[PDB]
Design a protein around this nucleic acid. Sequence first.
RNA 1: AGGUGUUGGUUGAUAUAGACAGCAGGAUGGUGGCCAUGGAAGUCGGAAUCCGCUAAGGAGUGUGUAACAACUCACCUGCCG
Lengths: 52, 94, 153, 196, 416
Amino acid sequence: IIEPSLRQLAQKYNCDKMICRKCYARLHPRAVNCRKKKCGHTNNLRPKKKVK
Amino acid sequence: AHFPINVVIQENGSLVEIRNFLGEKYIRRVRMRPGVACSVSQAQKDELVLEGNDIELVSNSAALIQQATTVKNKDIRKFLDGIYVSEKGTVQQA
Amino acid sequence: EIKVVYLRCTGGEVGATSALAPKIGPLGLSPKKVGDDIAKATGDWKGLRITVKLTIQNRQAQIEVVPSASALIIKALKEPPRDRKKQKNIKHSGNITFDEIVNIARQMRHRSLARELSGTIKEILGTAQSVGCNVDGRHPHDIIDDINSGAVE
Amino acid sequence: DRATWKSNYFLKIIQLLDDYPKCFIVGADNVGSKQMQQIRMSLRGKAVVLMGKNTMMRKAIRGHLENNPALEKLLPHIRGNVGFVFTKEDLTEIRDMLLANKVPAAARAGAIAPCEVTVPAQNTGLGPEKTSFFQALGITTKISRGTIEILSDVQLIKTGDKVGASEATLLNMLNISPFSFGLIIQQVFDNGSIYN
Amino acid sequence: SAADRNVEIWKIKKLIKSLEAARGNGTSMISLIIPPKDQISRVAKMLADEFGTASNIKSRVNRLSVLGAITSVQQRLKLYNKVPPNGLVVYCGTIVTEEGKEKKVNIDFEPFKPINTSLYLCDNKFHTEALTALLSDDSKFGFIVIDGSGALFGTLQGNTREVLHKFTVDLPKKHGRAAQSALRFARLRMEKRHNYVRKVAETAVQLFISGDKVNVAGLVLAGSADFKTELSQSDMFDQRLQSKVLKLVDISYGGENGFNQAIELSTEVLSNVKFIQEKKLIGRYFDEISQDTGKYCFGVEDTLKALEMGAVEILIVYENLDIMRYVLHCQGTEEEKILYLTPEQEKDKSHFTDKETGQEHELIESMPLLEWFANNYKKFGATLEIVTDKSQEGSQFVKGFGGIGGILRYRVDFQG
RNA sequence: AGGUGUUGGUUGAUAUAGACAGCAGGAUGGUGGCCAUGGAAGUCGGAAUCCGCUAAGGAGUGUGUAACAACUCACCUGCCG
């Protein structure tokens, strides 16, 4: 189906990330607070749920 | 992941054509900038190569192609098809 | 073709749901025969788990018992035959006389991992506290009883 | 705490240096935790391991240089994870003890190889694997009756090469160990002067 | 009480085994059932005129076997001044058994569950219709009734009727008679129907609920003038109670006159609940065979290869397996192991020889297979979910799979 | 109810005897510690919760399984100042 070390390059921009619980944002995986202003820089972060 | 993407260039570097990505019929065009030279590698297959004397102008040109290829309608943890950045550094080495 | 397998079976008495058969079902032996093989060979361990070794050859399996920590503590504190209704905490608390613990530090000498006998008795007493017991003062007292004039060989 | 903890180690080095006037210097590149406490069971009666931090070793020497000028030579002899396996009774029987008891295992996916590892034929004992991520590195083998017996004798890791990702993960399918994991000695400190 | 009921269910099932196969003589066997509501006074009347009438039976033996066995039951129900909750089952008479042997018997017990049945026979044996398909007939249903003049919650067993709770309310008029007031008097009149039907949604949490679960396997909602359709479909009505609502009954009557009519307006959906609860499990078994994970077994050799190890979750069984359990026991060697036999192998088969030491291998008495799987159902798993074969997917199950299954938990690696 | 915007304040620890990043090498046996359960190998669960070895490895920080396997982190090391 696909080369097994051209998948760690394709997953990095859509799969290995973090999310605001309060405004559904996308941020880099090594965060603590949301970036945006709408949630008021909250620290209710959680990771992007994996595929099966 | 099925439909190989065919990339072909013009204007000795300044324009880029992108065909058959997912098997779409429409043909994308991207324009890199002035003072930056696009290409196709000699040692790898589907390898674009983005040169030039400025980090900003170069890296914005990287990012136009990378955001020509973004999936609509569909779960993006599964279809992982595009053109995305590999190696940064320098044109010659010391 | 030797291949030594470790099966923590019911020991003296026979159990209920026998999951020995992924190890012993793709190779040969019956799923009824190994449950009663250990019924006699272990003997009067009664209901103590010991991980038994099987000398698996072309022919048949040699049944021999492995040295352990928790088997010697429940056997010395003496029981008649028991039930399976099992009261809250089957754990015990008597008084292990210091004749057995120094004898077990010579049996610990054959596993072979340690210094002298000033540091094998504190880890046999270290295994004895998990069931529930003490020998004239708890293991607080056994760092103060060993130094100056404890039973050192 | 870390105030009364150092107060026992500066008294242990003035004890162990006068008690053992001869010494060694050793490191620790790939040597584990069970592996230490198998070699602890070896020379116990005549070897006492004493590793440590650099500047606690650098400070302890300054009190000694007034007493013994012969300890002047171990101020630029600390590079790596330095330790000092003490010795007095024999220096040709303690080093040849740790020569013939190197505890082996399959290699790291990282560390370079001193030997230029040559590869004969072999057999695994498995079902159908694949020759799809193997033919890249350059050993074009034959799937001969289940177990893939090697046809070509091309070397992969040589003197100096970094054992990276693509030839490190494909050696977990075949199960092999080139070396034996152990402490590679650097210097030898005998009687106040360095002699090999 | 868990320990107080479960001594009474399985113990009295073995008393009903040996009495039914009684097999005595003549017609001297008083079989009897009283329903709980009735007086014991109207029985000592009846059986008084069945003692001068029973003296004109010609045959010498039959007549005095009776009038002995009729005046023993006369003094059993003197000790009873009333009849309790759940009734009274009277077994009197005089059997014959092993060894040309006559032994008189005179039982009288209060059963479990309030029965409703009435019975009086005198055959050559003992009679059981209303014990083995009412006390066996388990799953309960719930009956709400809605109207402007009242509401009422009650249950229906197989043949029992309980009236749990009811409550009346004084609902207003409909018919308006002003202009500006007649606008808001319509919000103010419909407002006093909402806190009624939310006092029937909320009173459905009082009577029908037990242990993060409801204590019934179905539900029916009655009424008239479409006031079930305002309890049945609202956001205030609970999710799990809303998903069991099996019927929308329209009728004449209400209260205690119209609780009886909703029991025989659903004679075609009260007997169509196990026909779905058993069809889902036979539909859920062929979806395991469809999918590529591999968690299913078949046969009496592969299900015993994979029940002793990691035991199955829901042990799938066709009740009528003909196969039963025979235990084998050698002569000289004294060696024994338990085995299972197919149609031909149990009747005439002298293959049962020791072979090893060359001796005769005799087989000590049997034990039924659906009965032996109930000797160990909580041991090797839990939930003994027995299934039938009448349905459109139950039909092929038995002959297609021989009457056995086992949806395994973890990835079991079979070998064949 | 909240904020790693920026700004005053209060208490208590980590440091040239080499911390705080980052970038590398370890993270053990008696032991699969005992009571429950079809299993509790440290990882639903229950109260109990030790020492041989040391520069350092806790009767255990999380991810993962029917039991594990397999991979992290507590605590210490080389560079760096």
